[PDB]
Structure formats: C-alpha cells, structure tokens
Ligand binder design. Structure first.
Ligand SMILES: *[C@@H]1O[C@H](CO)[C@@H](O[C@@H]2O[C@H](CO)[C@@H](O)[C@H](O)[C@H]2NC(C)=O)[C@H](O)[C@H]1NC(C)=O
Ligand SMILES: *[C@@H]1O[C@H](CO)[C@@H](O[C@@H]2O[C@H](CO)[C@@H](O)[C@H](O)[C@H]2NC(C)=O)[C@H](O)[C@H]1NC(C)=O
Ligand SMILES: *[C@@H]1O[C@H](CO)[C@@H](O[C@@H]2O[C@H](CO)[C@@H](O)[C@H](O)[C@H]2NC(C)=O)[C@H](O)[C@H]1NC(C)=O
Ligand SMILES: *[C@@H]1O[C@H](CO)[C@@H](O[C@@H]2O[C@H](CO)[C@@H](O)[C@H](O)[C@H]2NC(C)=O)[C@H](O)[C@H]1NC(C)=O
Ligand SMILES: *[C@@H]1O[C@H](CO)[C@@H](O[C@@H]2O[C@H](CO)[C@@H](O)[C@H](O)[C@H]2NC(C)=O)[C@H](O)[C@H]1NC(C)=O
Ligand SMILES: *[C@@H]1O[C@H](CO)[C@@H](O)[C@H](O)[C@H]1NC(C)=O
Ligand SMILES: *[C@@H]1O[C@H](CO)[C@@H](O)[C@H](O)[C@H]1NC(C)=O
Ligand SMILES: *[C@@H]1O[C@H](CO)[C@@H](O)[C@H](O)[C@H]1NC(C)=O
Ligand SMILES: *[C@@H]1O[C@H](CO)[C@@H](O)[C@H](O)[C@H]1NC(C)=O
Lengths: 193, 226, 316, 123
C-alpha cells in the first residue's frame, strides 16, 4: 500500500515539502509472498517479515557478502561486528541498509538508515536464512512531507495516476477545483532506418 | 413611504454583514495581488541554488577550493546567471505596478463621483439607479457599498401619445397618458400615481390631425364657475 | 449615424519551452536543468495572458441576464431595423452588417481556442438589440418594461433639450433620415475601403512576432551548426557541451524577448476592452450627457455589432 | 519536409509525430478523487490505462476528453474547457455539456402598451 519510504540523505528539514528523485518501491505494487528460493537482486530490494526464525541473508552473484545473526558480517575480504522492514541498495561501492521495525497494514512509516558498508562487490542474486515478502525498487520521484519534529509523515508517487502528477506540479496535497496543465506527450519512434 | 424605505435599507445592510461573516470568500481580487508578489519573490530566492554551468552554486567553496586564475572563470558564470534573474524580476514588477496604478486611478474617480456626489453614468456605481455610496477600508484596497433604487411589481396599461380635445393636441408636461380600460389619466414614468388630466399638467400644440395615434378625451379646466 | 471600432481580445498562444529550445534531445534537456526555473516562469506568464483574453470578452459582451427576443410583428413606427437584426435563413445568428464585417477582416507553438464561440457572441448582441428596441433603457436597471418605439424616441428627444411635439410632428421625416443613414453605412462597408484597420493591426503585430521567433531557430549563435542533430552526430560529448551551451543561451534570449513584448502588448488590449465595456454600459444601456463619448452631436441611442476580436458601435 | 531516396529515387514526404499537451480536470480533493484528462487536439484515435482507454470518450474542438460523461442539458459554466464546452461534478460523476447563456425571455411589445412599476426595492 504505502510502505518502503526511507530517508534520502542526512540533512535536517522541518515543515517543508521537498521533492526527491531516488530509487523507491512504487506504491500499490505486487510483492511476492514466501512461506527458500534463490531470488535475484535487480537493483534494490524491499524486505519485510512477520518468533525469531529469520536470521540473516546471503548476497552476491553466487566474493559474496554474508550477513548472519550478535551481528557479524563476512563480506569475503572484510569482517565487521556490531514486523521488521529492510531496504538494500548497492550504490557506488557502498552498501546502504535502511530499516525500521514496528509493533501488511495501512499505516505510514519511514525507515531510518542503519549502516553503510563501503565494499564494492557485484550482486545479482540473494537468499534469506531461516513469512517474508520481496519488493523491488524503481527510479521514481516522490514528494515527502516533513513535520515540526523533522520526521516524514506522508509522500506522493508522481507517476501513479493523473491526480498525483497534478499534486506534484502544484506542490501540495490538496488541490482546488480547476483545470491544470501537467505534462506533454509524444509517440516514440518504433525502429531505425 | 419613509418607514418602509428605512426598513428595507436596514435589512440590506444586515445581509451584507451576513454574507461577509459566512465563509463564502469574496476578497479574491485582494488575495491575488498578495499571492502573485509572494510567488515572484520565492522564485527569485530559489534561483540562488542553480549552478549555471559552474562547479558549485555556493561561492565560498569556489573561493576555498580554487586559485585566482581559474576562480574567475567559475565566478563569471554565476554572475551572469544571477544578473539575468534580477533583471527578469524587476521587469515584471514594473509591469504589475502599472496595472495597480490604473486600478487606484479608477478607485479615486469612484470616490469622487459616487461618494461625494450622485452619478448619472449607468452601471458605474452599481446596478440600478444610483442614490448614494459609502467607503470602507480593506488591506491594500477599498470597499464601496452602493445604494440603488430598483423598480418592482410592474403592471400593463394602454397608452397614447397625445389627447385631442377642442381641435387641439395636448401633450404631457412630465409624464405619460395611461388608461385603466375605461378612464384616462396621467402619471409619472417610474412610479404609478394617476391624476386627472387638466390644463395645469399638459401643454397644447397645433391641431389634432398630424400625430399618429391621438385619442379623443376631455381636458379639464380648473377655473370652472367663472 | 456613425461608426466606432474597438479591439477586445487577441490570440491565445502557448509555447512548449523545452521543445522549442531542444526538441527530442535528452542531452540538451539535461543541460537546460542548470538554469533553474526559467521555463515554468515563461509558461506561467503566457497562461496568465490566455486567461485574461477570455475575461475581456465576458465583461464586454455578457451584460444581460435574459436572452430577449424581438416579436415577429415589426411595427416600430416606420423605422427599419432589418439590416442589423439577425437573419435565420442563413444558418448563423449573424446579421447582414456582421456578415460584411466578418468578410472584410511546429516547434512547440500552439493556438488555444476561445471559450465563447462566434455564435454565442452573436446571440449576446442580438439580445442587447432586442432589449433596447422593445424596452428602452429599463432592462439595464431591472426588469424590462415595454414601451412603443416612437414614445421611447420622444423621451430621448426630451433628454437632449427638445420638446416632444417636434418628434411627433416630424415622425415620417425622422424615420426616413434614419433609414437612409443606415443604408449609407451598409454601402460604405460593402465597398472596398480599409475600415477595420485597428482590428487588422493586432493580427499583423501578433503574426510578425511568431515569425521572428521561428526565424531565430536558424541562427547558430557562435556554434558550428544551428541543427542540434548535426552537432550530436559529429562531436563527442565533452566537446558537444560547449556548442549546445551557445545554442541554449541564444534560444533562451529569444523566448524571453518574445514573452516580455507579449505582456506589454496585452496590457494595452486590456485598456481597450475596459473602454469598450464602459461604452456598452453608458451608450447602449443608457443615454449619455458626456460630450463626444458616444459619437459626434447630441447622443440619442447606440447599437452594437460583433466583429472578429472586436466590437462595432453605431451611434445615432 | 521532403527528400529523395538515394536508391529508388522516390520522392517521399516528412511529417512530425503527434505531440500535444495534457490537462487534468479536477474538482477539489475535499470533494472527490476522480479526474478527467484532456489531450490537446489529437482526434481520440491516437491516444496510464484507465484514463487512456475505456468508455467516456468525447471529441471536442479543443481535443480528446477521456473520463467525462457528455450530456444534453445546458448549465451555467463551471470549469471551462473551450469552444463552448464546460465540465462539472454532479452516483456522483463528471459531466461535459454546452454552456448556456441565460434564460429565454420575450417582451410583450405592441404599439399601444406600456408597463409602469407600482413599488420599489432598496438594494
Ligand atoms: C402584460 O400583457 C402581456 C400580454 O397579455 C402578458 O404577456 C403574456 O403573459 C402570459 C402569461 O402571463 C404568457 O402566456 C403570454 O405568452 C404572454 N404574451 C406575450 C405576447 O408574450 C404579460 O404577462 C402582462 N404583464 C403583466 C405584468 O401583467
Ligand atoms: C378606472 O378608474 C376609474 C377611476 O375614476 C374607476 O371608476 C370608479 O370606480 C369605482 C368603483 O366602481 C366607483 O366608486 C367610482 O365612482 C368610479 N369613478 C368614476 C369617475 O366613475 C373605474 O372603475 C376603473 N375601471 C377599471 C376597469 O378598473
Ligand atoms: C375624435 O373626435 C373627432 C371629433 O368629433 C371625430 O372627428 C369627427 O367626428 C364626427 C362625428 O363625431 C364625424 O362626422 C366627422 O367626419 C369627424 N371628422 C373627420 C375629419 O373625420 C373623430 O372621428 C374622433 N375619432 C375617433 C377615432 O372616433
Ligand atoms: C427594410 O429595408 C429592407 C432593405 O432596404 C427592405 O427590403 C427590400 O424590399 C424591397 C421591396 O420593397 C425589395 O425589392 C428588396 O430586394 C429588399 N431588400 C432586401 C435586402 O431584402 C425592407 O422591405 C424594408 N422594410 C420595410 C417594412 O419597408
Ligand atoms: C411594496 O413592497 C413592500 C415590500 O415587499 C411591501 O411590504 C410588505 O408587505 C407584506 C404584506 O403583503 C408584509 O408581509 C411585509 O412585511 C412587508 N415588507 C416590509 C419590508 O415591510 C408593500 O406592502 C408593497 N406595497 C404595496 C402597495 O403593495
Ligand atoms: C514532536 O515530538 C515531541 C516529543 O519530544 C512531541 O511532544 C510533539 O507532540 C511532536 N510533535 C507533533 C506535531 O506530533
Ligand atoms: C397598431 O397596430 C394595430 C395592429 O394590431 C393597428 O390596428 C393599429 O392601427 C396600430 N396603431 C397605430 C397608431 O398605428
Ligand atoms: C479523425 O480521423 C478520421 C479518420 O480516421 C477522420 O475521418 C476525421 O475527420 C478526423 N477528425 C479530426 C477532428 O481530425
Ligand atoms: C443527446 O442528443 C442526441 C441528439 O443528437 C441523441 O442522439 C442522444 O441520444 C442524446 N443523449 C441522451 C443520453 O439521450
């Protein structure tokens, strides 16, 4: 429904409406329900789970990152020791984990960044380690709503439906009655000659 | 009709008060000016975060990263980009100021001709026949309250341009000839108040065979016993 | 009977800013994002002009509540209004004089259609005529009250300082002089005189500016070409940067100059339309004492007729 | 806009692709979340899936309007579309109609009749 929104950066903002262009999980997408098939890692993965069975993860194209669980990471080389939702990204030699856990429902929640692991590996697939879902991230553009405490409380996916694109052009969440120019359109060429 | 007229005036003032205290917004012309000027200043402030082709939109970290030969190359790009946006702001402010001045000139004309006088110009001081107006102040504006006369409850009659009495054509001094079906009267034009046709409220001109549509009737002479 | 012509509106245009500066070139439109928000400023300005053009037409022509009709028995004391009343045999609401008047006078650039059509504007002018001819000046202040036309004409003579027996005793002469003056108006428009020059000037000034804007796309502004695909097929990206920047700079300067002169030109079409709204209210819905505001001489009455982007008044 | 084939020497024409603009008609979001979508001048045979196909497709002189129900009444104009067509929110849906100029009226004219008012109103 409306899940998998994180913090894009580490700049404090309060009571503004910032526009973000980053890789997100699009709203109202279809996520697979599992109940351990080896899944591919397209460019980023949403994960949730719903005790104490899920231990950790196996990453990499088969050097292969290993995260087990007490938390210990064995990237193969480097070693590190330090409802549950998780976001994974492999961007520019880094490895960004965003997570948050709660007491799939409808409520909105934002995932705070957990750790960066600047490793620089190649990943094309992954696997969990033993009630868990898998989403996939797309290049989007959201419109986040911060509050007095500087926390994200709402967002808008600017390519879901026409009303959302109206909301992103006017930069508001309420729209008055009217007619509004929002975009253009153009048929693309089919082939070369 | 003084008591009726005073009560209709008091009811209309009360309805002005009601349709303002209800949240049906009517001060849109004043809110538009505020919104346009705030939007222009927000655009001018957000244009300071563009790099215009340079390595950074912040000037301190060009001056902290580079040496004076190739710092000027990056500073000229920001200078031309920021001059062009100041120039655009100032030009559209000069175009909006001339429209606000023409509106203020119209308001000064209306204060002279509707508040300090009674006006014969149609639809200049409201709809109807203008009686008087009252000014009220508003934020960066003015509100006029126009008071007009509106005719009501009309009624059909039969009319004629002139009356023939003794081989002479009679015309109204100020009014029209009307008939209720059987009798003929003379009334003023904007309100029905019928009177007897005498020689005090008509004048005479020529014989009665030139006018298209003249009517035979009796014109009364008020010095009767002599 | 004389004639006065006024401009009311002009043509609603819109320019697609990204397509004008570099249509179908994503490596140009990624460089254009370094200039912030110039294109949204330009689009917002042109949209404000387009909305104002519909407002001008509303305030000149929509000054009646009812759509008044004239009766089929046309006995107006000998006065003949058939050249200015509508003719339903031709399929439009348009009258004879208005037929003469309408006969006398892509790189991202579109033209938006007006809100009110020509048929709707003709229906408004015919309701104004029917209201005047059957009820005097009473429909402009309340409900329309019928009066015979010669009696209306008698109190309009009374309002310029002449007694009303002068009208009633020279009625046939006055009707003949009115009908001949309308006939002469119809003849001089039917001839080949250049009468609608004020309306023609607006069309010419708006066509010259769009032609200059289109012609600016074939200047190279210091670059090796003015075609963007020729640059993108000849050069590598780090050297094509500095050529595309010169083209972007020149094309932005062209658009900014066009929009500044459109704003200045729309400011004067507003003033013309406010004057035409004032003349409608004070010369057509009433009788005016202001010297030379409604023709030349002592004003008796006025009639409106529609034109392309304009209005024609006939002052008696 | 024209060219010659370098092999068959045939004269064949060049014309650009479709290219319009896109507008979104809405009521307030404190009233509904339904929209209708206007495409500027594209003949409706060239045109998001729900607001791109289906029923409720109407060809105006302003372009192609998808998502509004064309009716035959005439109302006061609410949201202007252009060339006479307006749009309004009225089980509730979005309707498109020809705007109406006002109420029809005919004055009882003759050569010897007059109407005189008998009362008044302060406004
Ligand atoms: C004045 O008289 C006229 C003519 O009789 C009235 O007009 C008619 O009104 C009736 C309804 O009241 C309609 O059915 C007719 O179509 C009207 N006739 C015409 C020719 O339009 C008019 O209503 C009367 N006015 C008053 C105030 O009594
Ligand atoms: C037209 O008005 C005259 C006013 O003079 C009316 O005549 C009066 O009618 C009342 C009631 O019948 C009598 O008491 C008066 O004596 C009459 N006056 C005269 C001078 O005759 C007349 O009834 C009206 N006609 C219509 C059709 O309304
Ligand atoms: C209006 O009154 C005059 C004065 O009587 C009428 O004119 C003459 O009327 C007598 C009869 O009363 C006739 O014998 C004469 O021939 C009339 N004169 C002319 C020149 O014809 C007149 O007829 C009356 N009008 C109406 C409409 O009855
Ligand atoms: C009002 O004016 C029109 C135009 O001058 C008159 O129509 C003409 O009538 C004559 C017959 O007398 C015809 O030969 C012409 O061809 C008509 N011209 C047109 C353009 O139709 C009309 O008759 C006049 N109305 C009245 C009542 O006299
Ligand atoms: C002129 O109009 C006024 C305003 O409607 C009339 O006054 C009303 O008369 C009714 C009785 O029918 C009362 O119920 C209302 O309270 C009155 N209104 C006010 C504001 O006092 C008045 O009677 C009319 N005059 C004539 C002669 O008909
Ligand atoms: C912000 O957080 C504080 C907790 O320190 C809380 O008291 C306050 O209500 C919060 N603000 C809002 C708008 O919820
Ligand atoms: C008014 O018109 C009628 C037709 O209904 C006619 O009989 C009468 O003669 C006309 N009156 C005048 C003064 O022309
Ligand atoms: C739309 O295209 C059809 C052909 O499929 C044509 O008959 C019609 O005239 C076109 N309409 C417009 C408005 O271009
Ligand atoms: C609207 O009017 C047309 C007449 O051209 C008619 O064919 C159509 O059925 C009408 N629509 C409805 C819903 O009745």
């Amino acid at each position: 429904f409306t899940r998998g929104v994180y913090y894009p950066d580490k700049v404090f903002r309060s009571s503004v409406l910032h526009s973000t262009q980053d890789l997100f999980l699009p709203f109202f997408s279809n996520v697979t329900w599992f109940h351990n098939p080896v899944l591919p890692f397209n460019d980023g993965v949403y994960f949730a789970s719903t005790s104490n069975i899920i231990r950790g993860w196996i990453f990499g194209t088969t050097q292969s990152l290993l995260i087990v669980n007490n938390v210990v990471i064995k990237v193969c080389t480097f070693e590190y020791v330090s409802l549950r939702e998780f976001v994974f990204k492999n961007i520019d030699g880094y490895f960004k984990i965003y997570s948050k856990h709660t007491p799939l429902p409808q409520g909105f929640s934002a995932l705070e960044p957990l750790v960066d692991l600047p490793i620089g590996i190649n990943i094309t697939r992954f696997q969990t380690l033993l009630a868990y879902y898998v989403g996939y991230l797309q290049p989007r553009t959201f419109l986040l709503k911060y509050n007095e405490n500087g926390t994200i409380t709402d967002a808008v996916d600017c390519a879901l439906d026409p009303l959302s694109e109206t909301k992103c052009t006017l930069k508001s969440f309420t729209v008055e009655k009217g007619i509004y120019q929002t975009s253009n359109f153009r048929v693309q060429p089919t082939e070369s000659i | 009709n003084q008591k009726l007229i005073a009560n209709q005036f008091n009811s209309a003032i009360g309805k002005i008060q009601d349709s303002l205290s209800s949240t049906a917004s009517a001060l849109g012309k004043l809110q538009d000016v505020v919104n346009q000027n705030a939007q222009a200043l927000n655009t001018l402030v957000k244009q300071l975060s563009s790099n215009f082709g340079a390595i950074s939109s912040v000037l301190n970290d060009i001056l902290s990263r580079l040496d004076p030969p190739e710092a000027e190359v990056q500073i000229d790009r920001l200078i031309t980009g920021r001059l062009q946006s100041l120039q655009t702001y100032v030009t559209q402010q000069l175009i909006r100021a001339a429209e606000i001045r023409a509106s203020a000139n119209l308001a000064a004309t209306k204060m002279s001709e509707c508040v300090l006088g009674q006006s014969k110009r149609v639809d200049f001081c409201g709809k109807g026949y203008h009686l008087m107006s009252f000014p009220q102040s508003a934020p960066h504006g003015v509100v006029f309250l126009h008071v007009t006369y509106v005719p009501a409850q009309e009624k059909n009659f039969t009319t004629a341009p002139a009356i023939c009495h003794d081989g002479k054509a009679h015309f109204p001094r100020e009014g029209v000839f009307v008939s209720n079906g059987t009798h003929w009267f003379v009334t003023q034009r904007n309100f029905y108040e019928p009177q007897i046709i005498t020689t005090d409220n008509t004048f005479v001109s020529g014989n009665c065979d030139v006018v298209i549509g003249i009517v035979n009737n009796t014109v009364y002479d008020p010095l009767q016993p002599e | 009977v004389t004639t006065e012509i006024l401009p009311v509106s002009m043509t609603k245009t819109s320019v697609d800013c990204t397509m004008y500066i570099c249509g179908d070139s994503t490596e140009c439109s990624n460089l254009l994002l370094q200039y912030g928000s110039f294109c949204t400023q330009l689009n917002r300005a042109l949209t404000g002009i387009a909305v104002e053009q519909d407002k001008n037409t509303q305030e000149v022509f929509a000054q009646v509540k009812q759509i008044y009709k004239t009766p089929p028995i046309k006995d107006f004391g000998g006065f003949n209004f058939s050249q200015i009343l509508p003719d339903p045999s031709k399929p439009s609401k348009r009258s004879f004089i208005e037929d003469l008047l309408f006969n006398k006078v892509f790189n991202g650039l579109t033209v938006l259609p007006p809100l009110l059509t020509d048929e709707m504007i003709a229906q408004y002018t015919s309701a104004l005529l029917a209201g005047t001819i059957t009820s005097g000046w009473t429909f402009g202040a309340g409900a329309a009250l019928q009066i015979p036309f010669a009696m209306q004409m008698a109190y309009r003579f009374n309002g310029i300082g002449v007694t009303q027996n002068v009208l009633y005793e020279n009625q046939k002469l006055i009707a003949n002089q009115f009908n001949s003056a309308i006939g002469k108006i119809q003849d001089s428009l039917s001839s080949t005189a250049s009468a609608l020059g004020k309306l023609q000037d607006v069309v010419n000034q708006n066509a010259q500016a769009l032609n200059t804007l289109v012609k600016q796309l074939s200047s190279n502004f210091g670059a090796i070409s003015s075609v963007l695909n020729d640059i993108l097929s000849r050069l590598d990206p780090p050297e094509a940067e500095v050529q595309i920047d010169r083209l972007i700079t020149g094309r932005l300067q062209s658009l900014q100059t066009y929009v500044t002169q459109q704003l200045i030109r729309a400011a004067e079409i507003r003033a013309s339309a406010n004057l035409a709204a004032t003349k409608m209210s004070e010369c057509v819905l009433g009788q005016s004492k202001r010297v030379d505001f409604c023709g030349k001489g002592y004003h008796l009455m006025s009639f409106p007729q529609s034109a392309p982007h304009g209005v024609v008044f006939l002052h008696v | 806009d024209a060219v010659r084939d370098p092999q068959t020497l045939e004269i064949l024409d060049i014309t650009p692709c479709s290219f319009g603009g896109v507008s979104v008609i809405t009521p307030g979001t404190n009233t509904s979340n339904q929209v209708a979508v206007l495409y500027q001048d594209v003949n409706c045979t060239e045109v998001w899936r729900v607001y791109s196909t289906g029923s409720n497709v109407f060809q105006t002189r302003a372009g192609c309007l998808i998502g509004a129900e064309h009716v035959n009444n005439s109302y006061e104009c609410d949201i202007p579309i252009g060339a006479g067509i307006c749009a309004s929110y009225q089980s509730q849906s979005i309707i498109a109609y020809t705007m109406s100029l006002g109420a029809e009226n005919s004055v009882a004219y003759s050569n010897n009749s007059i109407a005189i008012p008998t009362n008044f109103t302060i406004s």
